[PDB]
């Protein structure tokens, strides 16, 4: 993952948080660290 | 008959606030006055529209994200000579500029169209050169 147009909530422990304008998908493991870009 | 043409009238001066005001909207009014469109005997090729001393332009209001968004640009004939400045920095350093830029573009382009720009003095104060009359407006 990490930066891609298709951001998922994958392992349910991840959230969509529209921070600083654009979408990220935060969790515990920074391996799930998507982003709407 | 034959339409009447004004004699050499005496230019009337005027004073305007600024602060709390909207940039465009403000100038919007300024211009129509730099010319005789407010006066009943407006004439195209003459220049008889009131002089306009504007005070504390350092505190003009601007909507949206202009403050951070709006970007003015200047181009020196030089390669990569494009220089663009944000409305944010225009206030800090010599802000009386913003109001002027805003108006200049809102006046004719011809010779007198700059001649009327001269009729406008703007100060980041208030305070002006208390030359004469200068009836404050709203």
């Amino acid at each position: 993952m990490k930066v891609r147009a298709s951001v998922k909530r994958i392992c349910d422990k991840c959230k969509v948080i529209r921070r600083h304008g654009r979408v990220y998908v935060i969790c515990e493991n920074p391996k799930h660290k998507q982003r709407q870009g | 008959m034959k339409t009447y043409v004004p004699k050499q009238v005496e230019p009337r001066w005027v004073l305007i606030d600024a602060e709390g005001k909207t940039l465009g909207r403000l100038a919007t009014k300024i211009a129509t006055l730099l010319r005789g469109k407010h006066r009943p005997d407006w004439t195209p090729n003459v220049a008889m529209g009131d002089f306009v001393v504007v005070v504390n332009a350092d505190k003009i209001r601007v909507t949206g994200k202009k403050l951070e968004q709006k970007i003015y640009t200047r181009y020196s004939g030089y390669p990569g000579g494009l220089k663009k400045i944000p409305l944010e920095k225009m206030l800090a350093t010599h802000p009386e500029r913003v109001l002027e830029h805003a108006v200049k573009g809102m006046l004719p382009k011809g010779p007198l169209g700059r001649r009327l720009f001269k009729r406008l003095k703007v100060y980041a104060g208030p305070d002006h050169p208390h030359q004469a009359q200068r009836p404050e407006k709203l």
């Binding site: - | 020196s76 004939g77 030089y78 390669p79 000579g81």
Partner: protein, 205 residues
Amino acid sequence: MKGILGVKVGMTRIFRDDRAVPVTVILAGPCPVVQRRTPEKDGYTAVQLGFLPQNPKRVNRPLKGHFAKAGVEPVRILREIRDFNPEGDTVTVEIFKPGERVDVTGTSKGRGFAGVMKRWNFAGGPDSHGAHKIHRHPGSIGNRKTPGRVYKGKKMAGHYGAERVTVMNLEVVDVIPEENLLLVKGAVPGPNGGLVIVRETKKAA
């Protein structure tokens, strides 16, 4: 940030320390301080500085023998040190002690209209194989159809002489009040015996 005026002389390499040092010398000498300049009636903080005395009939009129302290003008007239508020009297040389580094401004000598190689610097080329026609020549300038113009300031042949420069970070290891001299790391722009101001350097302040 202080300063002193000066005229150029000397250049050698004096075996100071044990190593060799290219020694540019300058006569700061009796260089007057005649008038300051304060914020409201000026807009900064500067001082006017004269030089070498020979001035009688050929000068006259306002002098600034007026000013408020006469002293007559030099002959090499006066210049201006910003951010410098002295003590009063005409300042000599010892303003700078040996062991400090400094900035220095002065006119460069004149090489006039030169050939682009010896100007900015291009290349030329075809001394043989090609043609003899374009030896010391710029070759090309702009692009074909668009822009279709000649770039603003795209380096071109012309003048490269009667100018002026300020050099930074030179090092003075001597100064003789006894005849008013200043012995620095040799790098001195301009010819031997002309206009040159010294000011304090800049590094981290």
